């Protein structure tokens, strides 16, 4: 019951990722992004951030978007407020300010028993995407899916891996999870 605890580890050296998972086959010249712990969302190293310097040069809107996604706010006004050395301050807000409580957030949904669970059996990715977009105003980014193909027996290594924007003919499974961008809290 202690092997089902979801934990994420931060590594100083990216070559130690070989020691995290036992069922995988190690290899000395494999990149970090291709290992099994990274493909499952368990390990993270700052080295993968070294590529953020080049993209910000080639695309000037990338850093703004990534900060908006992974920070949940932090407008330049808040940076100015924090720059005064008095620390975070505030209280009861005017209704005009409280209009900032409706921005979209990243969430995870399941195809098990929800209103859109009918796509778990025999459903395809495109149908689920268009249905969610039209009905609930939800945009789907990708899938988070069990590693073992025989999910009926659910092999002891109950690990999942991530697929980014699968094609329109991708077949779905009842045990798959979907990354979504939800709105209106």
């Amino acid at each position: 019951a202690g092997a089902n605890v979801p934990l994420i580890t931060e590594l100083a050296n990216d070559s130690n990722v070989q020691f995290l998972d036992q069922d995988d086959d190690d290899d000395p010249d494999t990149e970090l992004y291709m290992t099994q712990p990274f493909a499952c969302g368990t390990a993270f190293a700052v080295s993968v951030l070294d590529s953020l310097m080049s993209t910000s040069y080639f695309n000037d809107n990338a850093l703004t978007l990534i900060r908006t996604l992974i920070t949940g706010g932090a407008t330049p006004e808040l940076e100015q407020i924090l720059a005064e050395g008095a620390g975070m301050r505030g209280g009861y807000c005017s209704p005009a300010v409280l209009a900032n409580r409706d921005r979209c957030r990243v969430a995870q949904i399941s195809l098990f028993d929800g209103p859109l669970a009918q796509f778990g059996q025999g459903g395809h990715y495109g149908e689920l995407f268009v249905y969610a977009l039209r009905h609930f105003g939800i945009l789907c980014i990708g899938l988070y899916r069990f590693r073992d193909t025989n999910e009926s027996v659910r092999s002891p290594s109950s690990k999942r891996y991530v697929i980014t924007n699968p094609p329109e003919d991708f077949p779905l499974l009842p045990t798959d999870q979907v990354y979504v961008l939800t709105y209106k809290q």
Binding site: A83, E84, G85, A86
Partner: protein, 153 residues
Amino acid sequence: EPRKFDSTGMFHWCPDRPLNDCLQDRSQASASGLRNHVVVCLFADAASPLIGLRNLVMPLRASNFHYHELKPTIIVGNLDYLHREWKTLQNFPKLSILPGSPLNRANLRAVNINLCDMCVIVSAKDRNMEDPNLVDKEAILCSLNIKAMTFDD
């Protein structure tokens, strides 16, 4: 006018005081309407060698100045360094200490740095363990921070 000078009669004198008789926080400093004063931004550590701030306050307390012409002095910097330094400063009237850091903006707003007459940026930190172009980081950063700050008219 019961004015107390030195034995030589060339400097203003006050009886010895403990440090806490002059220590202040931001609320107390902002309560006192400091204006036309002198602000000493001291970038000192706890074990840094002494500068001798007496030599900076001694000329400002000469006896040829009327007591109402004396310019108040406020020192913003480390506190342990000021514990060490206070032994030579306790006899100068109209002197205040605000513990903290000069790079913080709340201190500079409390001190009323926009109404002052002079802001002296001094650094007591040890010198020349690194590149010679990186020995005045604190002074340049403080000068730019004070220049870029904006107050209310």
